[PDB]
A paper describes a structure:
We demonstrate that these proteins have acetyl-CoA:oxalate CoA-transferase (ACOCT) activity, which allows a core metabolite to serve as an alternate source of oxalyl-CoA. This study shows that YfdE is acetyl-CoA:oxalate CoA-transferase. We suggest that ACOCT is an accessory enzyme that serves to “prime” oxalate catabolism, forming oxalyl-CoA when formyl-CoA is not available.
The structure of H6YfdE was solved by molecular replacement using a biochemically uncharacterized protein from Brucella suis. Six subunits, forming three dimers, were placed in the asymmetric unit. In all subunits, the N-terminal appendage and the first five to six residues were disordered. The monomer topology of H6YfdE closely resembles that of other class III CoA-transferase superfamily members. (His233 from a partner subunit) is located in a GNxH motif that forms part of a loop opposite the covalent attachment point Asp173. The GNxH loop replaces the glycine-rich loop that binds oxalate in YfdW and other FCOCTs.
Residue numbers in the entry:
A (entry chain B): 6 to 381
B (entry chain A): 7 to 381
Write the structure that this text describes.
């Protein structure tokens, strides 16, 4: 089977990262996705680095399998075509600044009149409501205002961005989530709804410990770096060559670790005998640990620590991560349009998950046939 | 009150990854019955910090879920648990792979207990692959996925992202996977097995990190706060606290130079284009901060917004949740007296109240539920 959304029509006006990441998932799991791109260069990601064979890897990664037609909604003929699309469509998705779609003549209220069964999915930095709805909201801006920058990095170091476009991506997955939720709900109600996702809201929901601690203690930010707030030794540690993470969450495990490091004297040491004590005295404990670790390469410790049954792992680069046998076992690296790119992490039995997939479309590639299809 | 009204979720998930997914279902109308081990309950009940008796960690991600204790090794309970499954729409668990099977509940067995049942599992590496039975806390996943290596200032050691990203990713993927299967079932009239890996989930969030590698063979990238293709597009210090300036074209750069009284930079051959500003970003940043350090951040936010250049303060979590925008989006709700994050999925026509039912004490619904499902 080609997925649970096979037979759905998505009219996709999304661009950049936040919107298209969400719609890619719908396409991954069966839905027909027609990318409506504006005149000019089209979707902004066609002009994004990096490039392979003159073609943006950025566009390809998050638009593979999506058809492409250039439409100009300022033109009445094109507008007529777009409306015919909407009448056949289940989902209209866009991540323009709030108000953009309304000014082209497509408020949520007008959309309902066009198609009562149409799901309207919106994604933006702050959502379509609130005092900050019209404010600029790049991923970096959202990361800054959400608190995640100040929660991130070594405690004495300056605040730093998460190593990826977290706000955009959170918005994307919640966009996809909201859409499917609406599709399920529509099934009984027989009416569409407006899914309105904010990148800012999305990022707030990923704060976890940063917010919990504040609500209870009044301290903010936390800034814990690599170490766990409530367990120790549970942190990133250096070795002779390269760092590893040791996650030692209880007394039984601490004893095992000490055995493997030949630090058995620390097990009943009054500084380290219980977990709460090890958390309290984590710094001095780490000094003991890294002094022993520095005498052997990481690969030696991975063997010795794992042997005694303590959770441990190397710090890998993206390159190393995608080359792991596990990645290939999970089909998380696919080939689409002859390009290697990340796969679909949502695995559902009875749904095909091909390693080879249809590639991304060139600009207005399907424009001729699509214009014919929806002209009337 | 939401699209999932009328659904029954049997929830055996614990810690963060699994419950984050089911909390979303509960938020949007599903009846979620949390099945906890007798005595200890969900591990998060004994996670700090504590407020008025309850664990904040538990309450944040389990508010509105009913609580029953059951021992699936005990026959009387296993029988009640089975009656639950025959009426359930979804069974969710985030144990280690094989655990649910060893208790007598393979996907195969589950299928013939209730052919319509959606079985959903979240784990460190999924239920398939050579690393399926490997230890996989959030920190281990971040380390092995490449995200730690991508995170932090360029010449600084690798660092975890400031949250449990792997668990949360798997969480939302678990939720979205469940609801996808539910839509599918509405035509197929049959259940399916949703199988999410925190590792797969995290890899899908690598973005520019993985693209750049595929393109150039270099890895990691480590760019810190700086955009790879636009300048000045970075975090900058002021007299008191940092801000971010996100200036992506020449028109904006001219406007920004006006606000900072650095008009001489506009036609400077080092900064005349975006490509040149990226090449010479370091020295450009030095010029910018020398000016910025003369005024407090509030002053600069005003001056730079005035000329239409995207700018923002770096805020603590404390300041973020107090913004009027947060209140406008109902992202800080109260459940059982405790302030906590709201639901980012806003759907028109679906209720989104500020006051929600609080977390359940252990076995709180146990007597009434065990009656309800004894047969």
């Amino acid at each position: 089977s080609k997925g649970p959304f096979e037979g759905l029509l998505v009219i996709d006006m999304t661009h950049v990262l936040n919107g298209p990441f969400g719609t890619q998932l719908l396409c991954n799991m069966g839905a027909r996705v027609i990318k409506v791109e504006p005149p000019g260069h089209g979707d902004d990601t066609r002009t994004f680095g990096p490039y392979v064979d003159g073609q943006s890897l950025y566009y390809s990664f998050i638009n593979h399998g999506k058809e492409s037609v250039v439409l100009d909604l300022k033109n009445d003929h094109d507008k007529s075509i777009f409306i015919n699309m909407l009448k056949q469509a289940d989902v209209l998705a866009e991540n323009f600044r709030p108000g953009t779609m309304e000014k082209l003549g497509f408020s949520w209220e007008t959309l309902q009149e066009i198609n009562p069964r149409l799901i309207y999915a919106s994604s933006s930095g702050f959502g379509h409501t609130g005092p900050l709805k019209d404010a600029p909201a790049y991923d970096t801006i959202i990361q800054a205002m959400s608190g995640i920058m100040m929660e991130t990095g070594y405690p004495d170091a300056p605040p730093v961005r998460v190593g990826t476009s977290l706000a955009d991506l959170c918005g994307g997955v919640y966009l996809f989530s909201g859409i499917v939720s609406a599709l399920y709900g529509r099934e009984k109600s027989q009416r569409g709804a407006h899914v309105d996702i904010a990148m800012f809201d999305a990022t707030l929901s990923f704060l976890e410990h940063g917010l919990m601690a504040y609500i209870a203690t009044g301290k903010s930010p936390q800034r814990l770096g690599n170490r766990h707030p409530y367990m120790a030794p549970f942190d990133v540690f250096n070795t002779q060559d390269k760092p590893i993470t040791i996650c030692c969450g209880n007394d039984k495990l601490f004893s095992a670790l000490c055995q493997a490091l030949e630090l058995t004297e620390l097990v009943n040491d009054p500084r380290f005998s219980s977990n709460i004590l090890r958390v309290q005295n984590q710094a001095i404990l780490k000094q003991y640990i890294e002094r022993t670790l520095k005498t052997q390469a990481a690969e030696v410790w991975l063997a010795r620590i794992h042997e005694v049954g303590v959770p441990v792992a190397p710090l890998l680069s993206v390159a190393e991560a995608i080359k792991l046998p596990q990645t290939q076992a999970r089909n998380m690296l696919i080939e689409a349009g002859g390009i290697m790119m990340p796969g679909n992490p949502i695995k559902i039995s009875g749904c095909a998950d091909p390693h080879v997939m249809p590639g991304a479309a060139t600009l207005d590639q399907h424009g001729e046939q699509i214009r014919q299809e929806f002209s009337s």
